[PDB]
Amino acid sequence: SLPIEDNYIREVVSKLMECVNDAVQT
Amino acid sequence: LGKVSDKSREISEKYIEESQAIIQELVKLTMEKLESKFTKLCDLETQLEM
């Protein structure tokens, strides 16, 4: 139950192919 | 780019077949209103002559 340092608490803490397949064709 | 262009050029045609299907509706929907103005005007064909 000893408090810890504050600077240690602050220390521990498929949509791609759907266009390519349509850009290769047209 | 040509692979775009003709691919676009058919899509424009897809709206032309749209657009006349709107236009041939207005040529319908005007006429009844024009009919709704003949049936009033043939009233006056009597009344003025009265």
Swiss-Prot record, chain B:
Localization per record: Nucleus
Domain of life: Eukaryota
Assembly and binders: Dimerizes via the C-terminal coiled coil. Interacts directly with HTL1, NPL6, RSC6 and the N-terminus of STH1. Component of the two forms of the RSC complex composed of at least either RSC1 or RSC2, and ARP7, ARP9, LDB7, NPL6, RSC3, RSC30, RSC4, RSC58, RSC6, RSC8, RSC9, SFH1, STH1, HTL1 and probably RTT102. The complexes interact with histone and histone variant components of centromeric chromatin.
Record function comment: Component of the chromatin structure-remodeling complex (RSC), which is involved in transcription regulation and nucleosome positioning. RSC is responsible for the transfer of a histone octamer from a nucleosome core particle to naked DNA. The reaction requires ATP and involves an activated RSC-nucleosome intermediate. Remodeling reaction also involves DNA translocation, DNA twist and conformational change.
Anything else known: Present with 3380 molecules/cell in log phase SD medium.
Name the UniProt record assigns to this protein: Chromatin structure-remodeling complex protein RSC8
Entire protein: shown range: 407 to 456 of 557
